[PDB]
């Protein structure tokens, strides 16, 4: 229970953030991250009622000031929830321009962004439209190779889902110097869909976005795999190859040299 004087002032802050569009944010709002109980103070400001302009500025303020662990909570509890809410409630299922920036500002901090925005989304019933809009943000903004490689590695272990394939593909399309282990992880991910004892992934129908992602991997990391690994991918193409993309992948894989 905050002081009643504090509650009234931050209730006045809450009304401000509903209609705020430009200018300087209130001083009582700019100082929230320094507070230990920022979650409770943030609650009285009604984050769900924050204007799109406020979310972008608040995202700037908190990611910069808060620690990696606390900013993760801010991204997950507010930015992610607002991101999903705007998409589902919009008529065309598009994301607002100011919120669209806020995801980039969260990407300023990779670890907090990934476990606060990326992983919770894909592990909480992400939909294709959410993956597409989110994926473009990851595509356009710069990320470290190390953080991206860690993000790519985890995605492979998760059970195959349409949203997960989009996020994996953009990372592959992101044209990184992926560590050898990450490439080896990529080999296992695509290898697990080949029919052998094997799980349903062998027989699960594969959309093109999987094939395009597998094309990107063969496109970019053909010189990065061993001969034995290459044979396994070549077997995967023979068993699960696409009508048109499949021959293209076989060309790219065969053109690569072993490490």
């Amino acid at each position: 229970a905050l002081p009643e004087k504090v509650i009234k002032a931050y209730t006045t802050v809450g009304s401000i953030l509903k209609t705020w569009t430009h200018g300087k944010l209130p001083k009582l709002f700019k100082v929230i991250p320094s507070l230990r109980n920022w979650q409770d103070v943030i609650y009285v400001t009604n984050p769900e009622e924050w204007s799109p302009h406020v979310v972008y500025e608040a995202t700037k303020l908190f990611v910069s000031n808060l620690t990696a662990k606390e900013s993760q909570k801010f991204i997950n509890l507010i930015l992610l929830e607002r991101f999903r809410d705007n998409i589902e409630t919009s008529e065309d299922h598009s994301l607002n321009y100011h919120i669209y920036r806020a995801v980039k500002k969260s990407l300023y901090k990779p670890s907090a962004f990934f476990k606060g925005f990326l992983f919770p989304l894909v592990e909480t019933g992400c939909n294709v439209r959410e993956a597409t809009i989110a994926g473009s943000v990851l595509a356009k903004v710069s990320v470290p190779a190390l953080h991206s490689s860690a993000a790519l590695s985890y995605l492979l272990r998760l059970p195959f889902s349409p949203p997960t394939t989009v996020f994996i593909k953009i990372l592959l399309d992101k044209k990184y110097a992926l560590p050898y282990q990450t490439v080896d992880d990529c080999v296992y991910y695509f290898m697990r869909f080949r029919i052998l004892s094997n799980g349903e992934d062998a027989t699960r129908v594969l959309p093109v976005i999987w094939h395009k992602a597998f094309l990107t991997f063969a496109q970019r990391y053909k010189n990065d795999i061993t001969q034995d690994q290459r044979d396994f991918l070549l077997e995967t193409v023979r068993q699960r190859g696409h009508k048109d993309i499949g021959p293209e992948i076989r060309r790219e894989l065969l053109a690569g040299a072993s490490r």
Binding site: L2, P3, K5, V6, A9, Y10, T12, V13, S15, I16, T19, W20, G23, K24, P26, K27, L28, V31, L35, R36, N37, S111, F114, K115, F119, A145, L146, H147, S149, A150, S153, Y154, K175, Y176, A177, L178, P179, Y180, Q181, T182, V183, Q219, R220, Y221, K222, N223, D224, R251, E252, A255, G256, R259
Partner: protein, 237 residues
Amino acid sequence: KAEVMKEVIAKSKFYKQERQKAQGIMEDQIDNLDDNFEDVMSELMMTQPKKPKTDLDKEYDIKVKELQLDKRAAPSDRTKTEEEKNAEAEEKKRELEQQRLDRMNGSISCPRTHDALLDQVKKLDLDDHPKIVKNIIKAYQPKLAEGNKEKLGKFTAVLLRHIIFLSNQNYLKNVQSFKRTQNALISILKSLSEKYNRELSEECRDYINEMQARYKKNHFDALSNGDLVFFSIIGIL
């Protein structure tokens, strides 16, 4: 139509005035809030509360550390089809050809000077000159450090004066070895010229002035075998 737009303009102005009025009230609230900024904090700091990671979080951090230790792979571009490579190489041919027709109608030390290069190569045999010059380029590539372009750029001029310098010297004893060096140096000069034509161009124009100046006083005596070589290299480059 006249009435409708006036209503539209009136509506736009009306909403504009409301937004300004909302902004006017809005700005006042910050000032009142800012004035009460200290009082709110004095209570808030008094009520500050007294002093495990997710299993996913532990794995993610452990992955980052493990990823740092191991080596990083070189990423490589798509292999273009021979039809695409031919077409792209072919398309570049008209563009270069067409422009020409239009123009027709109207450890290792980088020597900044010619003499410095000789000192570095003073103890080396004639056939080793292509080796030393190439290493200087490798040792001082543009990416390695800032300012290497300028060092390579000046070295382009230095390389030119060297190729003319060798031709002046007698080589009838070891013509075969001498032949192996001039072409090797010239080819390197061609690679350098691609990136540093400005520095070569300035050096080329200076030599022309020097050649003319020596001609005024000495007549044919100033002219040397290298001077014939120099004109030939310009045609090459």
